Design a binder for these strands. Structure first.
Ligand code: MG
Ligand code: MG
Ligand code: MG
Ligand code: MG
Ligand code: MG
Ligand code: MG
Ligand code: MG
Ligand code: MG
Ligand code: MG
Ligand code: MG
Ligand code: MG
Ligand code: MG
Ligand code: MG
Ligand code: MG
Ligand code: MG
Ligand code: MG
Ligand code: MG
Ligand code: MG
Ligand code: MG
Ligand code: MG
Lengths: 144, 132, 86, 65, 149, 195
RNA sequence: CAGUGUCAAGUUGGCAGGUAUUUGUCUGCCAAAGUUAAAUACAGAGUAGGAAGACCGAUAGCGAACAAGUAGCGUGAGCGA
RNA sequence: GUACUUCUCUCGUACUGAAAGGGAGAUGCAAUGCAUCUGUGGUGUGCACACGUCAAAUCCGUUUGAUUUGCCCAACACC
RNA sequence: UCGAACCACCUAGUAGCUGGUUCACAUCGAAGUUUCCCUCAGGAUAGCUGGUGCUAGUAGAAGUAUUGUGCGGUAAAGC
RNA sequence: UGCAAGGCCGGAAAGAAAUUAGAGGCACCAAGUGGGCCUUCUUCGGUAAGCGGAGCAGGCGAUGCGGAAUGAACCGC
RNA sequence: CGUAAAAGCUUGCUUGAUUAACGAUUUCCAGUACGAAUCGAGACUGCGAAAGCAAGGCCAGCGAUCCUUUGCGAUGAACAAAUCAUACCAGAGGUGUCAGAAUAAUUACCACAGGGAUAACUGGCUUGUGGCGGCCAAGCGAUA
């Protein structure tokens, strides 16, 4: 939409909102991010505090697949057991059998108290996670 | 002025605009609806040409490689010499009756070929191969 | 300024840190060997204008107990001797 | 060209906002430790008391209702 | 703007007064401060270790912090369009216990003790009398005025 | 006539910029009620409707349960279950397994929040259906729902100012943690400062 | 990658395994010969055939709706109604 | 163009560390164990509570208790 | 055309510099100052200002006095 | 033990510092401006200035109207 | 500025001129660094009989990113080992244009963008200079 613009709204204003003293120029405060340490240093040091440095060691060939560890908490396990799959979790005394990596979620983090007793099968599991489940009628199982 | 904006990093400093001087280096997909129709027209027209053969060949299950995907199964190209030998078919003759052949796969786990050796003899059951 | 050869510590041999080895195969010099290689200008700036004539003194309190050198850093003094209070 | 003119009248447009009262940002922090390490432990007990005082309430308010 | 040091333009400000120099009081060493009372941050010299910046000299404010030998005082500072509650750290000798409330410390102490005496108390002893009204005044010496030269 | 009273005018949002034809019905409903009644509720529930969409923060059923459990612990224990009114909309909470039979009145519900209520034993209402039950809003527990912790509100600030735990606008999360955000890069943004 | 100097080994192998070096293992692969459709780029020969448009509407749209790369200009490259 | 789409990816529900890596419920007994819902105080809508108040009559303006929603300040715990 | 020709092209070269920038009414409405900058014909940052607000707000109100209570060393004075 | 201290607390407390009480508090986004000039009061530098540099407030800029014949600034408004 | 049984003088014994978990603050301020200070805490201490005093000599004397460098005791990503490198940490080498480009002229052959923000010019203004004048003359010669 071009009618929904202010230099179309402010025809006849003679400056489209850029003033008479300081005339709208082309690039006049540097061009780009220029001057981050010279004349825009007060902007960078103050809205971008950590910019302009080096830190840590270099990981040359970084592959995000071997460094892939999605996480789910204990209070979010119910997100993987349908009410029908939990309808068998009511009868027969059969604990739910949750398998994380099929839904994503390599690692199992222990946050909150687990609402429903189940047995999760996760590649990775926290110490407090490994302990809340095994003391809530459940069991963590390590896979892969 | 500036102020509390994300440092832009826009990466448009290499004459991509097809201006009056530069030829331009942009790829606009104004033809993808024509191409979707174009391919499905070849596809549906190649299918009645290859008929009664299936348009797509047979491809095996293969395990997507990395730890992110290793639990996801996938259709790889060709089977192996192994599944074909463990199912009778000569990989020279499998590659001519719709079965797709891959002389590079290595059958690292017997688990793997077992899903595919048996997957052949499903095809080799429901295939007529009427002679000429 | 003077400074004692010996300081007692309860928590001792003074060396007056004067390093500067300037290794090859340092990551910033390998870059430099690569970066200022061949054509182009002297592809890096160089401190041309004058300097602070006086230099600050790192002083390595190496304990006579074997290990774990300490480093104290004094102020900027022109003349520094370890005469140890004649 | 230093002037200071118009500045006192600029500071009084949107007003020279009064200071925040003491119950704002009364973080007894960075202050003298042996005080705040005691004004800490007494907060822990006074919270165990605040939690306990609500425990009888609800339980008194149940049976006595 | 040649000099703007931490002690600039302060000859007469930190200078001790006439014929009263030397060591600080024993009252100022025997003062008692809490977290919360008010203090006049009257930076005296002759201690020269813990004096605040010039600005915080006629200033009084809450004690937010009482370290062993440093009183921490918040002080309102009208910077440009807002006041900062500055948090200065000075020693005790640069500090008076500020009267600034005896105006009603001592007022409501006897004002209530007589409002109570006026509300319930025991009895109501009559208090200060009226100030501004009329009166048929009897003179005691007549006079006139024309000039004196 | 010198005034000085030039900036004392507050922006009250007289109307709504919403174009939803089912909320302009609730607004005309709650101008009638908010105007021709002595209800404190109807006043308040009317400014919250004409209010914008970013300001009507959603309350999860968790928040609704817990605060309705903090009401129902001090009642006549047989008096009534007040109606949890939220002028935003209700979202399910997979961190609350068991939900009480509580009546709720929201402009909207998640498809998983409506079924979680109705499965629990409560009935989720509307505002054309609450104007029939306590139109004055007797026995109704009005609710906002947290709008802090919102990712917009925690970029607000500078992030380079001492005592500013705001998040810089940076796509690359491992871009700006260098000089200025390190104690060993000539200055570290002072994590605390009295204000 | 190139140039110069140097210049191998032989499946008791060679190269690749994104930090150099040596010593090992492991994994993949087998350079220094060659061909190979399709999907991909292009409206330039519109060659052949076209179809369209929230486009421009004769100072606009191609420079050119017309005997337009024309008349005319330039020693010329060119310019250009 | 419209209609449909498993599959995947993407952003985020979890953050942190330079990295190896690690990874947040509360309460009581304990210094891990067992029942396992705002976390604390404070400032705090609305409504229900009783509290009287020129109050036409009695519904509301006053207010004090209850819970306090959002918000904010302080300091717990935990990663 | 010459202290670097001419044509075409890169090229719509860059310009903190100069000129211009197309309707109405309504509602408000400034600044030439702070700090930093090879900075002083410019920027960035605060202030000024608008819009959108959020919020329990006769209060954490005031370019004002009173009352107490501090502070000061200029005028005059005195050498 | 109890004083005093902190974090608290309930029982209880009212005023026999004027006025306006033209509503407090934050928050967000974004311009424009970053060449000022004059003036009152006082005052640094200069022989001096319709001079340069300041402090204070007011203005002009950005603003007419009324009148000092006349005037960006004065006097009224 | 300040200090007089000292903060100066003399002597003594000493390293607190150190590590500081650095916690907060002040000044500059944008309430950002930096620099210098202030109040602390933890050691370990010295000097004192002790209370106390000392984290230099008060307050000027100093330096970012990167790089180099040393101290201090995780990684090099198919594994393993030792070097090598890097990393975290704390410092040092330094940016005096001192919030930190790596720097000589000349143009009258000069060109451009502009500038009365800024000179020669011109219009003024400045009245002291340079040059003219008044009363009063020790007297000159009280004035031809
Ligand atoms: Mg501008
Ligand atoms: Mg300008
Ligand atoms: Mg496995
Ligand atoms: Mg959150
Ligand atoms: Mg070669
Ligand atoms: Mg070889
Ligand atoms: Mg190899
Ligand atoms: Mg080797
Ligand atoms: Mg070998
Ligand atoms: Mg080949
Ligand atoms: Mg024509
Ligand atoms: Mg409460
Ligand atoms: Mg005088
Ligand atoms: Mg006027
Ligand atoms: Mg006149
Ligand atoms: Mg001393
Ligand atoms: Mg400074
Ligand atoms: Mg510092
Ligand atoms: Mg010093
Ligand atoms: Mg001393």
């Amino acid at each position: 939409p071009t009618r929904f613009k202010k230099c179309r709204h402010q025809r006849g204003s003679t400056f489209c909102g850029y003033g008479r003293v300081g005339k709208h120029r082309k690039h006049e405060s540097g061009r780009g991010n220029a001057g981050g340490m010279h004349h825009h240093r007060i902007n960078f040091d103050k809205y971008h505090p950590g910019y302009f440095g080096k830190l840590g060691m270099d990981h040359y060939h970084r592959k995000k697949n071997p460094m892939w560890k999605p996480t789910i908490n204990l209070n979010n396990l119910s997100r993987l057991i349908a009410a029908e799959e939990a309808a068998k979790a009511t009868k027969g005394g059969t604990l739910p059998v949750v398998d994380l990596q099929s839904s994503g979620y390599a690692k199992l983090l222990g946050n909150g108290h687990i609402q429903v007793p189940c047995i999760v099968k996760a590649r990775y599991v926290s110490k407090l996670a490994d302990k809340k489940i095994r003391k809530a009628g459940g069991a963590v199982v390590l896979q892969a | 002025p500036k102020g509390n904006n994300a440092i832009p990093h826009v990466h448009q400093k290499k004459h991509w605009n097809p201006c009056s001087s530069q030829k331009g280096n942009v790829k606009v997909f104004l033809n993808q609806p024509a191409q979707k129709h174009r391919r499905r027209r070849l596809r549906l027209l190649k299918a009645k040409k290859v008929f009664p053969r299936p348009l797509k060949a047979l491809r095996p299950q293969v395990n997507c490689p990395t730890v992110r995907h290793n639990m996801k199964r996938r259709l790889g190209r060709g089977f192996s010499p192994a599944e074909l030998k463990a199912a009778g078919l000569n990989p020279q003759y499998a590659a001519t009756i719709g079965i797709r052949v891959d002389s590079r796969r290595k059958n690292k786990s017997e688990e793997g070929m077992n899903v595919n050796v048996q997957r052949l003899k499903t095809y080799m059951s429901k295939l007529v191969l009427f002679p000429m | 300024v003077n400074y004692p050869k010996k300081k007692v510590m309860h928590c001792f041999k003074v060396v007056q840190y004067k390093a500067g080895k300037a290794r090859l195969f340092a990551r910033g010099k390998r870059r430099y060997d690569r970066k200022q290689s061949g054509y182009g200008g002297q592809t890096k700036p160089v401190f041309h204008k004058k300097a602070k004539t006086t230099k600050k003194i790192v002083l390595k309190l190496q304990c006579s107990g074997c290990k774990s050198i300490r480093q104290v850093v004094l102020k900027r003094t022109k003349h520094f001797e370890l005469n140890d209070k004649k | 060209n230093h002037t200071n003119h118009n500045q006192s009248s600029k500071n009084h447009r949107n007003g020279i906002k009064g200071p925040m009262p003491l119950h704002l940002h009364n973080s007894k922090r960075g202050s003298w430790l042996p005080a705040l390490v005691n004004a800490r432990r007494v907060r822990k007990h006074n919270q165990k008391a605040a939690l306990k005082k609500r425990r009888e309430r609800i339980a008194a308010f149940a049976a006595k209702n | 703007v040649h000099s703007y040091g931490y002690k600039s333009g302060t000859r007469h400000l930190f200078a001790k007064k006439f014929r009263k120099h030397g060591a600080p009081s024993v009252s100022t060493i025997l003062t008692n401060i809490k977290v919360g009372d008010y203090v006049d941050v009257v930076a005296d010299s002759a201690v020269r270790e813990g004096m605040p910046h010039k600005y915080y000299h006629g200033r009084t404010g809450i004690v937010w912090n009482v370290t062993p030998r440093g009183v921490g005082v918040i002080i309102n500072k009208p910077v440009r369009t807002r006041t900062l509650r500055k948090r200065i750290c000075v020693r005790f000798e640069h500090v008076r216990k500020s009267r600034c409330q005896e105006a009603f410390k001592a007022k409501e102490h006897q004002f209530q003790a007589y409002l109570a005496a006026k509300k319930a108390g025991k009895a109501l002893p009559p208090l200060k009398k009226s100030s501004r009204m009329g009166g048929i005044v009897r003179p005691k010496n007549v006079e006139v005025l024309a000039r004196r030269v | 006539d010198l005034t000085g009273i030039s900036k004392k005018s507050r922006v009250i949002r007289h109307h709504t910029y919403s174009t939803n034809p089912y909320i302009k019905l609730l607004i005309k409903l709650y101008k009638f009620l908010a105007k021709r009644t002595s209800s404190g509720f109807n006043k308040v529930v009317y400014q919250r409707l004409i209010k914008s969409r970013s300001n009507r923060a959603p309350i999860s059923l968790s928040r609704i349960a817990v605060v309705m459990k903090r009401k129902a612990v001090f009642t006549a224990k047989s008096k009534a279950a007040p109606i949890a009114v939220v002028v935003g909309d209700v979202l399910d909470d997979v961190r609350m397994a068991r939900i009480p039979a509580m009546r709720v009145c929201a402009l909207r519900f998640s498809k998983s929040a409506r079924q979680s209520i109705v499965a629990a034993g409560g009935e989720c209402l509307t505002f054309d259906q609450l104007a029939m039950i306590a139109p004055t809003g007797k026995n109704t527990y009005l609710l906002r729902g947290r709008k802090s912790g919102r990712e917009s509100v925690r970029h607000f600030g500078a992030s380079g100012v001492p005592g500013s735990h705001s998040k810089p606008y940076a796509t690359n999360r491992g871009k700006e943690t260098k000089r200025g955000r390190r104690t060993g890069r000539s200055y570290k943004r002072k994590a605390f400062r009295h204000v």
